[PDB]
Symmetry: C2
Subunit: 369 residues, 2 copies
């Protein structure tokens, strides 16, 4: 049952569209025939054609099914007032009003039933999950029982299958959990879904975060990246929008996902080592403390890809005037052009700035949830 | 009006949902009250609660609006048979059947009206196009008058518009036509949309194409790339999925897309796996990179497998390319002509100065085939 037709006048009955084609008209051979005796006395009956119009489903060569209406009437078939026209066809969208002979003469409402159709999705998933909106191919879903939001990555049509198992083994509070996996035909990876949104939204609009908060998030970030590293994973693309926040509250758990500036200097001139993630965290810290990126073109004044390579980052003293020396120093030691000389995650965790049991206790507290 | 409720029993009336919340029940304070006199005599009336259930819209912190139903009834609110449960909530999807007190007792059908809502798109676009299904963001759309299927690439949040005008200047039958552009909310780029899908789908699953067909497609490919070159465009990322086929038929026109990586006149397109050239691993942005790519495409086409892939410790993929030692399975290449293998060879040279050019490739013995060239001319007559 791919479409519903909802009658809007007495003479007409509702139609469930299961078949691939439906003809409408007074002709006895029409799947939907107007010949009903109540309908025959509506005077406007005589204005209806023998084969008035047809609705049909066609497979568009994208594995998608498109509904069309096709006017064959002398007096017109109208979709939301607009006349289709004798011999013309047009796509039939959800909530279309079908009018006959007159523009205002509404007869049906058309509803597409293949919108949040669960039939597409495999049985094993549908038993645990309700599928919702696309979050742009990743979808929002709900646990049938607990009604808790989750995210589901979907992939497409051998070896990148146990790679999922290894990701599901990863267990760290500052890292997105692979809550569930479904291999049916497309790969369905159920993931955790952070509510507090992206750390990106928190620094957008040239505003900066509280230094205390930066430290709290950055500590978590460091822990997470370090864990990844010793689990043989280099993140390789680490940014404000990859860092998710657990709640609306400023004191919250940070979680990393996804396995423009943030490209490392060494990765511009294998060169795929851990230090690239450190560079990235450096850039994240910088944006967090300052509220602006360490690199951007403006004019002819040095290319962005040249700025990074020389290592000369954008330094606005007035902004950094109210950011502690150690905070600036960490960022400095983290944004070294020479990767051999760049700070490592261990080194960063030893840095004076993070020598702060006050926030560390805050972090432990947050783990108790 | 974000949702429709369609009554399925006489006592009930339809509901248009415009407000953010609607309570249902017998209590007079419910936005949808059951107290109607026809409804009062349906005996099952007495099984309905005072505040039976509510439907409401909530802004999920993604600029998206999610519908929920929430059961508060003693006897149950059911969504598609499934019981919601006293005090529980759940997302309410399109075409949900709401049943009261009994699982089978259907009362409403719920329809989401923010589904194929056209209000999202700019008027200029809607005047000419009916937007349809997504194809992953690139959505399908229909020319309002002709009903011609076209593709519309939608983007995100200055001069990335001149680029469009330039790409619009490109006029070759083997290159995707940019039918239109809209700068408003997101940048909308209306494109031709080939009916035959990607050349990628044609070689997927370790299967190879007919050698005759390869030649037909590869000729076209060569022409297209050459044209691009002499129009100051280096494609820079050329692959099976960038090559589109005009129809289901094996003999068809080939069209090239994606100038998202290309460098247009002087600059890199402001829109900004194996197909990386050896020189571009060690400016180094010359035409010869496209030749390398076409070489790799030819290789995949004829053989049905890629010239490079890691397998094990046995040489890295990025090292294979640089030494130029491609994967050669004699049993596969046993039924591919010598000239075909020779073209691929001359096209996959490590030294870019020594690599074949598009002109050189078109002079190659393999493409000295007026039989297929006549076939191509035929296809132009359409």
């Amino acid at each position: 049952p791919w479409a519903r037709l909802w009658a809007l006048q007495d003479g007409f009955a509702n139609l469930e569209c299961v078949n691939d084609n439906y003809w409408f008209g007074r002709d006895k051979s029409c799947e939907y025939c107007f010949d009903e005796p109540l309908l025959k006395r509506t005077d406007k009956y005589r204005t209806y054609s023998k084969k008035h119009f047809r609705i049909f489903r066609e497979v568009g060569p994208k594995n998608s099914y498109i509904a069309y209406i096709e006017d064959h009437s002398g007096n017109g078939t109208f979709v939301n007032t607009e006349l289709v026209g004798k011999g013309k066809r047009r796509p039939l969208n959800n909530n279309s009003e079908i009018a006959l002979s007159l523009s205002r003469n509404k007869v049906f409402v058309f509803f597409d039933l293949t919108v949040d159709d669960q039939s597409v999705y495999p049985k094993a998933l549908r038993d645990e999950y309700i599928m919702s909106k696309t979050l742009g191919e990743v979808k929002l879903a709900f646990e049938r029982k607990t009604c808790k939001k989750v995210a589901i990555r979907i992939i497409s049509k051998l070896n990148v299958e146990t790679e999922i198992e290894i990701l599901k083994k990863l267990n760290h509070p500052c890292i997105i959990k692979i809550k569930n996996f479904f291999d049916a035909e497309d790969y369905y990876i159920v993931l955790e879904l952070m509510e507090g949104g992206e750390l990106f939204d928190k620094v957008v609009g040239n505003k900066r975060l509280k230094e205390a908060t930066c430290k709290l998030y950055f500590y978590q970030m460091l822990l997470a990246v370090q864990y990844l590293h010793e689990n043989g994973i280099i993140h390789r693309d680490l940014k404000p929008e990859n860092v998710l926040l657990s709640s609306q509250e400023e004191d919250c758990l940070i979680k990393i996902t996804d396995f423009p500036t943030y490209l490392a200097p060494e990765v511009l001139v294998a060169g795929y080592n851990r230090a690239v993630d450190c560079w990235s965290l450096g850039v994240i810290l910088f944006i967090c403390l300052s509220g602006y990126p360490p690199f951007s073109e403006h004019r002819t004044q040095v290319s962005l890809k040249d700025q990074i390579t020389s290592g000369k980052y954008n330094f606005i003293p007035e902004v950094w005037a109210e950011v502690s020396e150690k905070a600036l120093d960490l960022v400095k030691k983290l944004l070294v052009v020479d990767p051999k000389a760049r700070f490592t995650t261990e080194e960063a965790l030893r840095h004076p700035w993070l020598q702060d049991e006050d926030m560390k206790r805050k972090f432990q507290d947050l783990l108790s949830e």
